[PDB]
Amino acid sequence: DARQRLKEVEVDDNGQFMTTDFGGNIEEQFSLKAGGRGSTLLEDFIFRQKLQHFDHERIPERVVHARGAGAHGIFTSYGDWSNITAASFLGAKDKQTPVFVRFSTVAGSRGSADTARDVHGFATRFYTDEGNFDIVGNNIPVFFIQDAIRFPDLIHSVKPSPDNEVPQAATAHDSAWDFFSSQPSALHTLFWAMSGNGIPRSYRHMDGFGIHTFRLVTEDGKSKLVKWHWKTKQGKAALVWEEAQVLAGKNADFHRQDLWDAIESGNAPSWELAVQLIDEDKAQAYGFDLLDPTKFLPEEFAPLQVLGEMTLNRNPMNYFAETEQISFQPGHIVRGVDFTEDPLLQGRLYSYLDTQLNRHRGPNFEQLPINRPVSGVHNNHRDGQGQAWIHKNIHHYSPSYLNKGYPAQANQTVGRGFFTTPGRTASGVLNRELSATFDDHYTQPRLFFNSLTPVEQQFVINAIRFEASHVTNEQVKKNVLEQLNKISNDVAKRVAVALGLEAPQPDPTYYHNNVTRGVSIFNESLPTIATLRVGVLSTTKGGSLDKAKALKEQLEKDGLKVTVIAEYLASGVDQTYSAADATAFDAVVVAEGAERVFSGKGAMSPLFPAGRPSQILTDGYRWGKPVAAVGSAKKALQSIGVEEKEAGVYAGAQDEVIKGVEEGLKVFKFLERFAVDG
Amino acid sequence: DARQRLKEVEVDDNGQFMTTDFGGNIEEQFSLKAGGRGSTLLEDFIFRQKLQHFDHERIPERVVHARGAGAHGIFTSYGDWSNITAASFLGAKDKQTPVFVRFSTVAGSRGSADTARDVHGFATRFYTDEGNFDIVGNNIPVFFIQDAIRFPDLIHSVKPSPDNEVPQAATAHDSAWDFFSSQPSALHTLFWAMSGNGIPRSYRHMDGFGIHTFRLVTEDGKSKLVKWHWKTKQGKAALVWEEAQVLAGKNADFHRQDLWDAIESGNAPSWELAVQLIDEDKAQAYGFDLLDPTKFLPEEFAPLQVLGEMTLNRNPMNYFAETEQISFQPGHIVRGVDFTEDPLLQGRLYSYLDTQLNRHRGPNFEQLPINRPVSGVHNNHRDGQGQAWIHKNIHHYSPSYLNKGYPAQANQTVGRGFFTTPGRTASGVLNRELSATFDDHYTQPRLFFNSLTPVEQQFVINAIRFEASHVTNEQVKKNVLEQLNKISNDVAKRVAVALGLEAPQPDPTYYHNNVTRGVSIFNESLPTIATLRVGVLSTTKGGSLDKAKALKEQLEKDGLKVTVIAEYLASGVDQTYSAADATAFDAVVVAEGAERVFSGKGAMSPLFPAGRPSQILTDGYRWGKPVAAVGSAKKALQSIGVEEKEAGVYAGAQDEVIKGVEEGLKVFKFLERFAVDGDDEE
Numbered sequence A: 001d002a003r004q005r006l007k008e009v010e011v012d013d014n015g016q017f018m019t020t021d022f023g024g025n026i027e028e029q030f031s032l033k034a035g036g037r038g039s040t041l042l043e044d045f046i047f048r049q050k051l052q053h054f055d056h057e058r059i060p061e062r063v064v065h066a067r068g069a070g071a072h073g074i075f076t077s078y079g080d081w082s083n084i085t086a087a088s089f090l091g092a093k094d095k096q097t098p099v100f101v102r103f104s105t106v107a108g109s110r111g112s113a114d115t116a117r118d119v120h121g122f123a124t125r126f127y128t129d130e131g132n133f134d135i136v137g138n139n140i141p142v143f144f145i146q147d148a149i150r151f152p153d154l155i156h157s158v159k160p161s162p163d164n165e166v167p168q169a170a171t172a173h174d175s176a177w178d179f180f181s182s183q184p185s186a187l188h189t190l191f192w193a194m195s196g197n198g199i200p201r202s203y204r205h206m207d208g209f210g211i212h213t214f215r216l217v218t219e220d221g222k223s224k225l226v227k228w229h230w231k232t233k234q235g236k237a238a239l240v241w242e243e244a245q246v247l248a249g250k251n252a253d254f255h256r257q258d259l260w261d262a263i264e265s266g267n268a269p270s271w272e273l274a275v276q277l278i279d280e281d282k283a284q285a286y287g288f289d290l291l292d293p294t295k296f297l298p299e300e301f302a303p304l305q306v307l308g309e310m311t312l313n314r315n316p317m318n319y320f321a322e323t324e325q326i327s328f329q330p331g332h333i334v335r336g337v338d339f340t341e342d343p344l345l346q347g348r349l350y351s352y353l354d355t356q357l358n359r360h361r362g363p364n365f366e367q368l369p370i371n372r373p374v375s376g377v378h379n380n381h382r383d384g385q386g387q388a389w390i391h392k393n394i395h396h397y398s399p400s401y402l403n404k405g406y407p408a409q410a411n412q413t414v415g416r417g418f419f420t421t422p423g424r425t426a427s428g429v430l431n432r433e434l435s436a437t438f439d440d441h442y443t444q445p446r447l448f449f450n451s452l453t454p455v456e457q458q459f460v461i462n463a464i465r466f467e468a469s470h471v472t473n474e475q476v477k478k479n480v481l482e483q484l485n486k487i488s489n490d491v492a493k494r495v496a497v498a499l500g501l502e503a504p505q506p507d508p509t510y511y512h513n514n515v516t517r518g519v520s521i522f523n524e525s526l527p528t529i530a531t532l533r534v535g536v537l538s539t540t541k542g543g544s545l546d547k548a549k550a551l552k553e554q555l556e557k558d559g560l561k562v563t564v565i566a567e568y569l570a571s572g573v574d575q576t577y578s579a580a581d582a583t584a585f586d587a588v589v590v591a592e593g594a595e596r597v598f599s600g601k602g603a604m605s606p607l608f609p610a611g612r613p614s615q616i617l618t619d620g621y622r623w624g625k626p627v628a629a630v631g632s633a634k635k636a637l638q639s640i641g642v643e644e645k646e647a648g649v650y651a652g653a654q655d656e657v658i659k660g661v662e663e664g665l666k667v668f669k670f671l672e673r674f675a676v677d678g
Numbered sequence B: 001d002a003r004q005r006l007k008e009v010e011v012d013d014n015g016q017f018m019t020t021d022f023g024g025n026i027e028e029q030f031s032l033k034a035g036g037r038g039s040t041l042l043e044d045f046i047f048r049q050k051l052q053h054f055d056h057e058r059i060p061e062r063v064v065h066a067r068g069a070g071a072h073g074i075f076t077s078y079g080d081w082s083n084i085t086a087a088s089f090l091g092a093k094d095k096q097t098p099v100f101v102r103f104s105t106v107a108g109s110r111g112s113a114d115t116a117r118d119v120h121g122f123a124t125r126f127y128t129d130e131g132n133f134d135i136v137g138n139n140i141p142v143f144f145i146q147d148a149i150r151f152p153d154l155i156h157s158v159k160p161s162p163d164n165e166v167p168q169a170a171t172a173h174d175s176a177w178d179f180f181s182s183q184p185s186a187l188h189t190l191f192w193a194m195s196g197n198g199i200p201r202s203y204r205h206m207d208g209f210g211i212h213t214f215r216l217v218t219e220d221g222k223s224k225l226v227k228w229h230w231k232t233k234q235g236k237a238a239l240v241w242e243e244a245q246v247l248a249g250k251n252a253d254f255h256r257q258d259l260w261d262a263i264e265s266g267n268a269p270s271w272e273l274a275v276q277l278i279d280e281d282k283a284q285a286y287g288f289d290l291l292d293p294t295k296f297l298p299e300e301f302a303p304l305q306v307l308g309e310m311t312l313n314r315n316p317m318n319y320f321a322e323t324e325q326i327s328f329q330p331g332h333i334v335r336g337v338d339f340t341e342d343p344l345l346q347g348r349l350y351s352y353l354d355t356q357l358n359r360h361r362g363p364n365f366e367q368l369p370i371n372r373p374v375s376g377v378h379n380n381h382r383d384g385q386g387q388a389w390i391h392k393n394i395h396h397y398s399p400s401y402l403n404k405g406y407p408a409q410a411n412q413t414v415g416r417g418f419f420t421t422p423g424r425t426a427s428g429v430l431n432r433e434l435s436a437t438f439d440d441h442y443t444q445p446r447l448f449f450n451s452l453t454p455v456e457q458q459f460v461i462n463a464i465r466f467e468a469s470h471v472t473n474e475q476v477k478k479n480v481l482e483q484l485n486k487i488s489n490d491v492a493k494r495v496a497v498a499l500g501l502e503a504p505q506p507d508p509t510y511y512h513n514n515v516t517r518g519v520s521i522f523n524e525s526l527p528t529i530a531t532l533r534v535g536v537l538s539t540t541k542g543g544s545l546d547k548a549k550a551l552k553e554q555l556e557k558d559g560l561k562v563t564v565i566a567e568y569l570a571s572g573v574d575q576t577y578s579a580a581d582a583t584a585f586d587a588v589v590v591a592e593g594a595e596r597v598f599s600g601k602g603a604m605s606p607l608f609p610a611g612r613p614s615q616i617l618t619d620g621y622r623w624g625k626p627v628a629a630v631g632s633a634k635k636a637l638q639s640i641g642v643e644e645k646e647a648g649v650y651a652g653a654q655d656e657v658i659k660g661v662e663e664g665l666k667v668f669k670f671l672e673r674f675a676v677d678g679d680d681e682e
């Protein structure tokens, strides 16, 4: 049980009488009053201690990545990696380390929708036996900016306009595209956010990245540059925008519920931890600077090497105490890992320690159960708001004769202390500049775009078309096109169409046709369809429900999560048409007999909004899902102009429908249903 | 200009060089580094001061009503009301007082959707010349619970489950309905939240209520019991649930955008302030106890008396400094007004002062520009975090010979001080009980349901069906039915159908057929269509766009906000099909020629999602909006099976369509398009 250490702070209230926070049994359903219809008394200590606690429940949300959810798990090392790192959690084959992971969007406040288009956070804590090590990563391998000092500019520009606080959880507004075009470094991450990575099917269907080049350091001080990757065992999968939008309203909790359900159902998600490892002398060898976080390292130059696997298999018991309070920091580093001179990383180190002071309102946040390491804390820190321990050492300073030298200094040679990479040097003048090696903002955006499938490329174009069309300022829109043109004239032209502008002439400076692997989502089928969701459209009239129940049982055999939908909650029915929507499902299947709710009297029940069943089937099809109908239910497909010969559309007997749907769910999205320019 | 007083703290950065927060011009686009590809230096004071400010930007959201938006405006008294109150802001005809109003939902966090189903906040500050007076109201006249001590219970049950923090901004889950059924006083507000009040078309189309009985007190100490009402001059209007859901996704900012736009466009919204006035000796004379916040006073017993009007005409300059930071309190009271022994109001007084300490992390939040009164602060308060003043009086205590008696005591007869209603008395034993007069939890929910139109009643039932069907626990659903049945056997029967439960046996103790005016939304057409939105569906091909532009100009004459939609942003086009949705508009009109995008090739384009023009027209129709088509565009209506002669459907020449659409917009929703229980029987 990854959560074991937390059991000692769990509080069970079952079978108990109500109390105040300072003990003593009470009742707290009536205010104390002066007379039957009298005023409430100030001496009502019960009322006040209860309302004061309530009044003060809220803490500031994260300044970024406010919207998110997490779970506990276990990371298992596949080997003794002492040849590349001194890091203890990687020191032995099969060595296990508890983890907690939080996934998130970036721009939106708490309560914003999971399926907004955004970069996503993928933050992992390893509670190692040598301290907490966090990889605070995203689901996209590059970031918008090259120097941490520019972070408030980026974030201000993306978050809501400061006059009216519009729009929520969206880059689709003037200030964001003003920034993207004024600060061209941003174009690469922008392309990723405009691809499927911006609207993932779930947290479980994302890869993860540390983004920055870090260093692995061995006991003897030897170093390697490293990129951290998390490779999803569930496969990458993305929504389509028009679906993400409806889902944002129909279930803002889509991703957090998905993770929760997967874990509760015993379908814990896994990711392999992989690294790219390159020598120090490669820092500038690949046509860009590895200190530049707006670039990724093509796998063709340095393949992924798998180090282990983490599985998330325990949900939190209290979301606030665990998920909300957890405080990640890239400065949570351990022996065997070191930083690089990445100027984005450099400033994060400051920011994440400082921000906790805001969010936790005091300096002792590492003492919160979710933040505590498992490995022991021994130092001369004292006091501070909410000090939860009682220190025994009264000689809280070093050096000292009186404490006999304890706690003692640890370094590279004694006590397994942290140490900076011995070979690192500094040379040159102090400066407020960036290396000219950071200057190319367009080659990699082109590389990424090149590496997507034709429809996948169209999604990127259509996302930009959608977003930029919201920009009211004409010149910003032209500025955007000028910058896009530097990446691809074709991209610029196709976007320009939507904006009713003329794209600039070709500017071939950065154009090229190279491609790289591992960045596409839609070029590969899913490795498993376990946990995927099938909505079975039925009806309470006739024999449909019994067949739907039979269909459900067979589908659940293949690890699928099945929802039988009908007009009302009859025996066997999981959800009403009123409550159902296609966004909730990876596949939509009309049970035989249910055609009766697609036309005629059966389709006009006051029990659901007009057209509801047809809409679900229509949405499912247009959004590229496998859709099917059993037996006579094929009339339902006919009612919406859909034909059986189409890819990802299935009809016939129950056996045949199940087989096709299950194969279709591996394809996941049927891209033949989306038009491409030309 | 209601914001005039705020000008002194406004900061203009145009034409200036960048500085630190302690002055000194700087650059702050590059971190200071030890060498060309070097590590960042700790001595980079510029970096740290910039990022420290960024790092500490957020403050806690409000514990309830975290999601909302506000505006500045002016309140004008219609007369000298000194005959009923000593309140200075009501003391002369035409007297003007600056106001700020924040509207909100309740359950959802910041960032949740404006069109979630929920009670809505309607909080108004009057910056009077005798201190700040806040009416902290909602858009529904009754509250869930009868004693403030139960607030954390209600709120906890309605907010997301504490294990996984699901669901956001919704009562549609087990714990909420467990609470509603375990604590039946909640049933009244529940019915209102399940009506159109739960899903208003905008903040501008809501009424407002103080909910509690308060007291108006004259100079001589005579009091009357009072209910505060805000009556929208824009008329009440609501969405349908299936619409509100899509809108939550398509535009989470729908309501804050609507208010912002109305104000920017010079279409400031207004509400009349009205009161019901009750004799003290009639507190329990109307079939319930006026100290009970779960009850409203039927207007048949005590009609609304209009005292004045408030108009919101200025948007904020900085949302955070103004809207987010403003701190309302029902304890913000002034001479001429007093509290009552309403046990819910009673505890609010404590909670709103205390909670500011959490949100603002300090005791000086009244010093923030948006919280400051216009009338002057003089007392012996000192220090505290963030103290923004420098006090001159060194004898900061009373009584005192050394300060000559200043600041001096003010009371009823001296210095126009606040005073508690002199006639108020306490009688009886100290108790942790509620008056038996509070016992009836079903009569008024029944009264409210009786007072809605048939389709309006259907909306309530369908909302309950939708919500309750989310409850996983079977006993909880049965508990809910047992409670609904105490209100109305037919309601429980109709809801039971959805849940697959047996229609309960009548339990007539509280049943009655009484009706009251002023609670329906749909039984009345809008007084104005100004600001309402028309989506004109057009095309870049052919002559459609030119005709669309003409249609637009005429519509705009009648005060409408018109969006011309096409495949891409050609000249005259306001929005692409890709970016458009029916939820954005109050009416949808297909411009002549646009029928080409409803079928065949024109409907197949990489520029928008398959079926988008059709989906917009379909949604508009199904959600009860006025829909229309000019000339040949009638083919678009045909394509979605809509007959040209239905109510709320307009087809013909440009002139006729404009006429019909403008007429339909006053009706606003065409309720004939919604099935009522029994309709589908053979």
Ligand code: HEM
Pocket: A061, A062, A063, A064, A065, A068, A102, A103, A104, A120, A121, A122, A123, A136, A137, A138, A143, A147, A148, A149, A151, A210, A211, A212, A293, A326, A327, A328, A344, A345, A347, A348, A351, A352, A355, A356, A359, B051, B055
């Ligand atoms: C490679 C670039 C970056 C990545 C991958 C990244 C990732 C993340 C993630 C995943 C979180 C959410 C952690 C959680 O779930 O609690 C987060 C939060 C945060 N980030 Fe970053 N971020 C990056 C750049 C930056 C920069 C440049 C800054 C400032 C210099 C910054 C400052 C912050 C702050 C202040 C928080 C809030 C932390 C808290 O409140 O606990 N980030 N970031």
Ligand code: HEM
Pocket: A051, A055, B061, B062, B063, B064, B065, B068, B102, B103, B104, B120, B121, B122, B123, B136, B137, B138, B143, B147, B148, B149, B151, B210, B211, B212, B293, B326, B327, B328, B344, B345, B347, B348, B351, B352, B355, B356, B359
């Ligand atoms: C008639 C019943 C009630 C009404 C009409 C009401 C209305 C409101 C409104 C409109 C707001 C948001 C104000 C804004 O826009 O900033 C609010 C916030 C709040 N309410 Fe109430 N409420 C009621 C009951 C209660 C009760 C019984 C309590 C606790 C005893 C309570 C505690 C709070 C708190 C702590 C806030 C946050 C205030 C802040 O953070 O500034 N409310 N309420």
